[PDB]
């Protein structure tokens with residue numbers, strides 16, 4: 076009742092868009108599009124969005140909107156797969172631990188960019204080496220190809236270590252930046268005025284303005300003409316191979332943030348009679364448009380750098396933090412007034428990270444609150460938020476150590492790759508195959524006011540589970556040990572990452588022991604029949620909305 080509602084649908088749309096658009100749309104998508112064929116890769120991309128992304132997004136949004144309960148509540152349909160919700164928390168923990176750290180790094184790149192002359196531009200500093208031949212050097216990759224930005228990142232932002240067990244003194248600037256980031260998130264998420272409602276306006280709109288300013292500065296007369304023909308070229312003969320289709324499906328699934336407790340949490344707070352069908356296609360379209368726009372803004376300046384360096388664009392191209400912190404800044408430093416575009420870029424990165432961390436902390440907080448929901452624990456939601464924030468800050472300290480980025484990449488690659496796919500597959504199977512497709516269809520028709528579109532039904536029953544199984548199989552078949560620029564992680568890392576992935580994957584089958592022998596456990600067929608039929612509680616979480624068929 077007093078859980079609160081959005082009050083304005085624009086608020087929900089903006090918060091959801093801010094969560095959907097993450098840092099992946101900045102570095103992961105442009106390089107993937109460049110590497111995976113060429114400008115034709117959009118055809119495997121958007122088609123997947125039509126058949127994989129939008130249906131799953133609609134499923135999650137309708138699930139949350141009708142359930143009117145958090146990450147754990149939505150699973151009151153079958154009180155056996157509730158552990159899936161538990162898993163949806165655990166992954167939401169891991170990302171929430173290693174997302175802020177990235178923000179932390181970006182935060183350290185924000186204040187350091189307020190100086191008159193950029194610190195990662197000139198090789199006259201005392202942390203340089205003999206291999207600092209940079210472009211702005213007026214006064215062994217191939218021969219000495221170590222740009223000053225990479226040197227600054229490797230030697231001053233965090234002193235990289237050789238092994239993984241080498242843990243030196245913690246990086247004090249990174250500790251301070253992580254503390255500032257966590258404090259900002261908590262102070263915004265106080266719910267004293269709103270559940271980050273009227274503060275998600277700026278954090279969800281300003282990144283678009285910054286991207287627009289960057290685009291106008293990057294498509295002016297700079298020589299960045301052969302910087303878009305390498306991103307908008309018709310390499311049609313690279314759509315036959317299954318690898319590009321698998322990568323497109325993976326990007327569609329991971330970029331949209333499906334099935335880790337993000338969409339469900341803020342879909343729960345929605346009013347019941349909300350056109351969630353309109354509220355899913357719109358957000359998916361904005362996410363894809365943002366990815367496309369980022370594919371232009373970065374690559375324009377990358378082509379400018381390629382022209383100024385006398386090399387082709389393929390020489391300068393990175394997939395993750397390499398593009399964010401050492402490739403893009405080394406190109407931004409060459410503009411006539413650099414520490415304004417650099418400031419805008421880092422501010423936009425901070426805003427994009429916050430747009431997702433807000434939702435992650437909301438998901439964890441609302442799950443914890445709704446699990447033990449009484450008139451006591453709803454009165455002190457802010458205290459729970461403070462406790463979870465301090466726990467996240469304390470747990471994230473080792474990731475700002477000398478070997479922080481190794482563990483960051485390990486957690487990114489392992490802890491939230493298999494578990495997401497498995498969780499989504501299990502939820503998709505259970506929702507319309509264990510509970511029933513027709514019951515869910517009439518349930519959706521109850522809330523939307525119209526039957527679901529004739530295409531979404533056949534996409535839910537057939538196309539979406541098949542695509543999820545396909546991406547699972549492609550992930551299983553395509554696997555290589557996680558490696559840095561040049562480093563092979565020993566067992567101390569691969570085994571640990573496997574254990575972290577299992578700590579979320581196995582969370583589902585471990586719930587099967589909570590169904591004790593009291594629930595008619597013997598005669599296994601009867602026990603399976605029970606503990607999965609919806610109880611007297613599942614349904615709309617309000618009165619005057621029973622509509623006869625629910626609780627006469």
Ligand SMILES: CN1C[C@@H]2[C@H](C1)[C@@H]2CN(Cc1ccc(F)c(Cl)c1)C(=O)c1cn(C)cn1
Nearest residue numbers: 095097098099329330331332395431487491
């Ligand atoms: C594999 N991952 C897991 C997970 C995906 C891809 C989510 C995190 N990532 C990228 C990322 C964050 C920090 C990193 F250090 C690196 Cl390497 C990558 C997002 O972009 C994102 C997506 N949504 C919906 C919100 N954020």
